[model samples]
Target: AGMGPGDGFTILSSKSLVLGQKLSLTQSDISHIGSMRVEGIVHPTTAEIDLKEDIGKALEKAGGKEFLETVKELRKSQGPLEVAEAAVSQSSGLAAKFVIHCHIPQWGSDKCEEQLEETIKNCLSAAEDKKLKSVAFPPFPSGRNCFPKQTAAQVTLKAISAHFDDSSASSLKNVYFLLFDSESIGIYVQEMAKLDAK
Candidate 1:
């Protein structure tokens, strides 16, 4: 169960399309991929605005008041699956240049699955809007929102696949799902493999 940063698999790759994107799953910290040109990172948060998790804490510490202010503003007008961008300082120590705050409804809430898919699509579109070639996402709605590991994996992979399938072209070249736990990684691996088989 000792997984490293570069240990990952490509769930999908397309060389013929305008997007020509590669979707991957990795066992690594989202904040630690500084060497890669990851332009955007998804910071999964609940609609209630909880920043107690490790990713949130790191972003809060590094991004400081400026980042929090934008998040505060976003939360005011937030809806299910809403997303907004915040600037990150160059010295922030985060790999991605900017953070895309994705507000998701609670797992057991009504229309949660639909909202999750919409939220993920918004995140990808937001990245593409900014011309971001690469983006990284942590296993969303899983830790604090209590989304079951298997369901989270299925939903996440499905949403990304749907996005790519629905879009004719995209500016995004790389989409990464950064998983911290071995269990989550294993589930994602299985889920991704299933998707690839289809």
Candidate 2:
């Protein structure tokens, strides 16, 4: 499928990092873009998306009812071992090869910072395990229970940077932060500039 005008926003980049105003979930043009990350609760109710339009649209556009049911059933019997830091799944209508569902356990605490960092780190691990080359991620930790946007971006950028810098070899090559609008795109771009400067 032909891509949209891309919302008329400039796509920002720094090495393997990419910032764009498009989502890999609903856009078939990016279907081959490997995995995309989803932030939410395991047992999602109508209230889940009340705080973020991106989450709502992602589910809706990616075959909402079916997709949600699948995710819910997958989490139905999960223990704490795979709840917060990492929960990966195969994509259906979502189009990508995989989707990493992360449930942020808390926010505004030391644990929040630790969990968010681990969650993203686990995602990179899952991608490498599956040998995925191009994974797309949302601007993580953004919402009611979300992290401060700037801080979240900083943490996320640092995690991705560290992943590639490791001496160990990995299949993952590209990390795309799929920002849905200009506001988010700007936020990531700013954080990326700081990361790039260093």
Candidate 3:
């Protein structure tokens, strides 16, 4: 049997994190919690548009035409691991209040940890600035970028933990990881169990 929209489970929920899933970001109504979009340093070219993998296609499909346009424009001014904000219109069908487009480096690249941490930090900062209660994330550098699932969980959870630990005044209440499959969910659950143990 195959999973349908909104078909997933919560791995953990606590004061520090609320890891969970959905079939795809496109199928969820992110209006209240907002969402994060992972991107590469350079925008996809016209010829490469069809080459988009799951996350990019989901964002483009749910966020609509102008969302991709805004990201392309942001690329002209931003560098790798930098982030920018865009509003998700009601007409787009997925009514996220906004999106934080994060430019992530390839998973195995040098300084990947540093850059990914910075990107996550910036994303959380933007959410707090807007006083959003929550934000949903796709597993960064995974899928098309080939990030190892265990490493992705460790790195992502660490960065998120550090952000909340260090920033006591943050308004954000929930941090969600919208995993697409059971294996991904399992890995994150294992990693989160380790975190809770500490």
Query: In terms of TM-score, which candidate is strongest?
Result: 1
User: Which candidate has the highest lDDT of all?
Assistant: 1
| Candidate order by decreasing TM-score | 1, 2, 3
lDDT of 2 by residue, 15-109 (tens): 43333212121222222222233322121112122223454355445645666665566556542344245555566564356665555545666
Clashes of 3: 0
lDDT of each: 0.64, 0.51, 0.50
- What C-alpha lDDT, on a 0 to 100 scale, does residue 23 get in candidate 3? 12
TM-scores for all candidates?
0.75, 0.66, 0.65
Candidate 1: residue 168 lDDT (0-100)? 76
Ranking by lDDT: 1, 2, 3
Q: Give one digit per residue, the lDDT tens place, for model 3 in 65-174.
A: 77666655555554233222222212233434555555555666787767667666777776676666666675454455666778767777787777776875777665
Model 2 segments beyond 4 Å from truth?
1-10, 17-53, 64-66, 79-84, 196-198
Q: Any idea how many clashes model 1 has?
A: 0
lDDT of 3 at 128: 71
Off by over 4 Å in 3: 1-51, 76-92, 143-145
Candidate 3 worst ten-residue window by lDDT: 38-47
